[PDB]
Design a protein around this ligand. Structure first.
Ligand SMILES: [Cu+2]
Ligand SMILES: [Cu+2]
Ligand SMILES: [Zn+2]
Ligand SMILES: [Zn+2]
Lengths: 151, 151
């Protein structure tokens, strides 16, 4: 009922820490213990496929692309807040990284259950997340910088 | 059912923006539109008294002290997470301020209802919030840097 998730830097292939997932009566808590990340807010979402391998897009390599799109069991095909229902159920609150490159601020996803996360990937993006597909799709998260699979 | 909250810098007495509170089926959403704040994570809590005036502590002035301690209707007398019940019900997720001094990342408090917040003050601290009374009390938020009352 409680699984630690190893996270790997997609560019370097080097481990950057772990993320602990806990079920509580309000949702799933995500407690990071990561390092070597660029300071600031990062797009943070659960993804469809249970893989962190790369994919291919029109001739270019997509790091962590094998994970697929954002977890969306309701097939909303929209990106939004962690507290709104008509958008990817995998949309999590943005993840904060200190000036020292560390991420330790815990975060909650009220619409998720721990059980449904098994076999899915957790992704950390380079850009932020304004919880909209505007001006940039998927909240402007951009490239995927860190990933881990939830066994 | 939806009230905009004007926030004031305690040191300068100058307005720093507003914070919109919205009730959703998962809790109370807090959407900031503030400026002139020091970059980084800030302690963010709802306080007991409906005032942002100063107070007095053993001969020294306490900016925003009139607001009293953290909202704690269950009298837990402990500081913790926004998703744990045996701690101040007024404990909110930390607030992020960009390098440009702006705060725009929305935040959720699942244990609160919009109705119960009327007449209370929202406080923003200088330090962060590790959601514990250790090593520093109240999460290490420290001095109060910005405040507003929820009419
Ligand atoms: Cu993502
Ligand atoms: Cu406070
Ligand atoms: Zn999404
Ligand atoms: Zn507290």
């Amino acid at each position: 009922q409680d699984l630690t998730v190893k996270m790997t830097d997609l560019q370097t292939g080097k481990p950057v820490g772990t993320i602990e997932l806990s079920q509580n009566k309000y949702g799933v808590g995500f407690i990071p213990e990561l390092a070597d990340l660029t300071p600031g807010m990062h797009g943070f979402h659960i993804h469809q496929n249970g893989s962190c391998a790369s994919s291919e897009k029109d001739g270019k390599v997509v790091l962590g692309g094998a994970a697929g799109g954002h977890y969306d069991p309701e097939h909303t095909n929209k990106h939004g807040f962690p507290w709104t229902d008509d958008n990817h159920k995998g949309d999590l609150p943005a993840l904060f990284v200190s000036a020292n490159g560390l991420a330790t601020n815990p975060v909650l996803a009220p619409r998720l259950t721990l059980k449904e996360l098994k076999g899915h990937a957790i992704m950390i993006h380079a850009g932020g997340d304004n919880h909209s597909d505007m001006p940039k799709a998927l909240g402007g998260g951009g490239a995927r910088v860190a990933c881990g699979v939830i066994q």
